[PDB]
């Protein structure tokens, strides 16, 4: 024959998760704590937390 | 045989044994003044509202006890539009005509008050399922 | 509670605010002035401030 | 903080609903939904 | 014609949301903090709190 | 502890779809989703 099927059919999504390349750790200052943590528990820490 | 449906008119013929209206006492007995090709016009039916007798019909008497039928396309102010011409209809007979019901619940209140025997459905739900998709 | 029996006339409104109460978090201070107000919410939104 | 005074975990959904099952019927007997028997008997006459 | 087409289509429920005509504001007293926040938070709580 | 920082109740998804209403069209009116009118409105041009 002279006609030719073409490839598209359904495209599935490509998911596959690929593993991160941009990222960071840090170490939580004081701001985070006092605005997350409450007063009770906060006073209580020690200075090398 | 399905004869039913749920929709917002009456779904029923004026006088039909579900409507239950005795129409004998609506009976007019006249006299028609001029007889046209397709209208007949009498004036004593020029003093009741427009289209107080759409939807009716015409009974006259043949022969015998036999009465030979027509309908009433419209009937506005002294003249009436007869269904299929007036052929046949005598120039000087006694003529009894009916009225009509539009079948609304409206209409069939405040004219014959029988809204108890109202077959219609005018607002009990249009649309509404309990398996759709957003109740709101 | 805190509280003493005082005269209601005809017509006054009773709450049982008893678990149906709106709480700000957020601790003030004693004579500060606030400005609230509130926002119904229906499934077709949100009412518009 | 703490735990809230009261939490709205889900919302209770009430409908009035007015439907006809056909032309006149004899008695009903019972009604399942879902699988789920949620009310079995018979009434003859109107009422509730 | 005769006939007339009556109103009722799908009739819309109207959501449309209204502004909030009754409310009130309070201030919470001693009794819903000590039955929602915790002994060790409480206690450290001010009296101008 | 006590309460997270932020909460993720819930995603918001977002998707570009193109598609065909047939042959050639003189005017879309609206749009009905749901039951709820999205959007009403005329457009009779190439446009956004």
């Not at chain 1, 024959?1 to 840090?26: E, M, N, Q, S, Y």
């Not at chain 2, 046949?88 to 025997?117: E, H, M, W």
């Not at chain 3, 005269?7 to 957020?26: C, I, N, S």
């Not at chain 3, 003030?28 to 939104?45: H, I, K």
Request: charged fraction near 20%; proline fraction near 6%.
């Amino acid at each position: 024959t002279g006609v030719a099927p073409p490839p598209p059919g359904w495209t599935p999504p490509d998911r596959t998760p690929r593993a991160i390349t941009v990222r960071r750790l840090i170490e939580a200052p004081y701001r985070e704590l006092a605005g997350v943590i409450d007063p009770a528990n906060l006073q209580l820490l020690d200075v090398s937390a | 045989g399905l004869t039913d449906t749920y929709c917002r008119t009456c779904t029923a013929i004026v006088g039909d044994h579900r409507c239950k209206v005795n129409l004998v006492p609506y009976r007019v007995t006249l006299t028609p003044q001029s007889v046209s090709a397709w209208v007949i016009s009498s004036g004593v039916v020029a003093g009741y509202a427009d289209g107080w007798f759409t939807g009716g019909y015409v009974e006259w008497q043949v022969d015998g006890d036999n009465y030979d039928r027509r309908f009433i396309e419209q009937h506005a102010g002294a003249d009436l539009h007869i269904l299929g011409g007036t052929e046949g209809i005598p120039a000087g007979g006694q003529l009894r005509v009916y009225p009509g019901c539009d079948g609304l619940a409206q209409t069939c209140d405040d004219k014959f008050s029988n809204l108890p025997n109202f077959r219609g459905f005018n607002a009990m739900q249009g649309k509404s399922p309990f398996d759709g998709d957003q109740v709101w | 509670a805190d509280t003493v029996p005082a005269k209601h006339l005809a017509g006054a409104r009773v709450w049982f605010y008893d678990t149906f109460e709106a709480v700000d978090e957020t601790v003030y201070s004693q004579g500060v002035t606030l400005q609230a107000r509130l926002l119904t919410n229906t499934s077709e939104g949100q009412l518009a401030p | 903080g703490a735990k809230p005074k009261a939490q709205t975990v889900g919302w209770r959904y009430y409908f009035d609903i007015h439907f006809a099952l056909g032309k006149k019927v004899d008695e009903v007997c019972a009604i399942r939904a879902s699988g789920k028997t949620a009310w079995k008997g018979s009434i003859t006459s109107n009422g509730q």
